Amino acid sequence: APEYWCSIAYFEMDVQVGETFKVPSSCPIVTVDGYVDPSGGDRFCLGQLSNVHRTEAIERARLHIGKGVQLECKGEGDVWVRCLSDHAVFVQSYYLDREAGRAPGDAVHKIYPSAYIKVFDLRQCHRQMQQQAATAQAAAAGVDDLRRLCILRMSFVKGWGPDYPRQSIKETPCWIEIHLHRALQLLDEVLH
């Protein structure tokens, strides 16, 4: 159904850099890297982007983005990441929180170079969604929270931990937030 299967916003620390990259439903695999072709379509390059508030440190980091990552939408809306870069990437995924037995949002998931890891399951998201809503309703008789089930965030190069010099992802020199549109349509139906 949806026109774009996700859309991706690039940030350097707490400032969005560049425009939001929308990914057409006919481009199930989208590469996000450190090079410079501005085309659009199935590749979102970050090498070329300007930022008036850029620092030496952010510049340094941008060098390691390199081949970056692929984000692949598999069949029934499941999302995989493949880390083409030669530096690891760090991810926020409730699915990975679950798979590893951690409380939601209470871990960061380092993905290692060459790795190909599954970071979201549409059916699970939809189930968790239906279920939490149906219960909270019937108890009476996390909208901002349910929303977060349909979103991944990832930092190239540097992780953020308690546990790390930097505490949140907006303190990392170059990261992205990825809104998954089928998940968001489903939650829209659920909320009605």
Add this chain to the structure above:
Amino acid sequence: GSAFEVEHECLGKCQGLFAPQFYVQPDAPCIQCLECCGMFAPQTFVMHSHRSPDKRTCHWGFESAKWHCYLHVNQKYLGTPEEKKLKIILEEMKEK
């Protein structure tokens, strides 16, 4: 003179000195932990760390077999003359 420093960031971190002279067989100890002074084969170096993971971090997809993807030059050599030279030598050492 000919050995250069290297590093990895898997399941921890470790810095070492790589001597291309000694890398004569796949299993040849050519890298020394700058902390413990032990000599490691590349694959075993990639498994060698004195720090333990935060256990707030979860590590996905790691394999020592893929050491070639994880081993880099020391950040000391960054934004320096020698960055670009050492990478090709390192890349050459990955081919073998």
